[PDB]
């Protein structure tokens, strides 16, 4: 089996994207931030705290002939940006884009924070990192990728995602008339459950190539991209005005700015993300400061391969029994 769905940006800034997932029976189609930084799938619904919610759409279990319970099963997810959602969980059947999973867990919200009530345009997350991240209790549960896994043509999903613009995620084939020349794959290390892998270097606009080892990890549920203080610094310095602000909590730059490129390794293979993709626009409307999407991750503890990279490529998510990632240009 394979699956193909169309996953289209939040707002003008392709701060997240939301792809829609039918759930249960009949059918509730939900827009769901896929997110390959985390395994829960996890959606609004008729349980979540009435405060709480606030336009999105919800998943009502009663109304689906196939749902059930998962008795005694609790689920509790924390972040890396502070956001949080819990809950209790239920098996239903789940559909993307024509492939089908049946018994999926289905992780149903009480309680989320602020952010995900403010976003009315995300129905809930559906993770794509390994399975072993998965919040549920005591009985962990698999995500929608593990569980098509076998039924797939071949074990793999590809993230497309688009520059203010519609893109693709696909299930079980890889889509060769989507990108140009060829895939490099990179190993992959599934010790802390990320699609975590080693970049070969970066280059900033047309100055030379920095051959560095970058271990980071592939997140599209990440806007940004986050990485080491040093690399960050030697992009900014190329763009005249920009600064990092602690009291806006991070690099930004004139508005009236001409951003250059950003090149990033993958084995001997190069992506470009162009200057345009790094402008995040204003830090608050009407300013002439602008927020700037190459960020340093020495706060975080790990670097992040986020939407401003992963959008520049056509990225290969091989869940083979020894996993692996794959970038091409497009």
Known sequence: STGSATTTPIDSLDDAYITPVQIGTPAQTLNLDFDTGSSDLWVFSSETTASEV?????????????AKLLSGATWSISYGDGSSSSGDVYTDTVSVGGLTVTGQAVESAKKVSSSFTEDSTIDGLLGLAFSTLNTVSPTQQKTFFDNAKASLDSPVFTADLGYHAPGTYNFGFIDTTAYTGSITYTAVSTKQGFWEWTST???????????????????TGTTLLYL?????????????????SSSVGGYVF???????????????????????????????????????????????????????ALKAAFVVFNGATTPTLGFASK
């Open 54 to 66: 606030d336009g999105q759409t919800i998943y009502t279990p009663s109304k689906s002939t196939t």
């Open 201 to 219: 270097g970066y280059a900033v606009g047309s100055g030379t190539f920095k051959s560095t080892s970058i271990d980071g990890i592939a997140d």
């Open 228 to 244: 080491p203080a040093t690399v960050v610094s030697a992009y900014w310095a190329q763009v005249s005005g920009a600064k990092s």
């Open 254 to 308: 004139p508005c009236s700015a001409t951003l250059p490129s950003f090149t990033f390794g993958v084995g001997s293979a190069r992506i470009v993300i162009p200057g345009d993709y790094i402008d995040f626009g204003p830090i608050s409307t009407g300013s002439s400061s602008c927020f700037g999407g190459i960020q340093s991750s020495a706060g975080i503890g790990i670097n992040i391969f986020g939407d401003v």
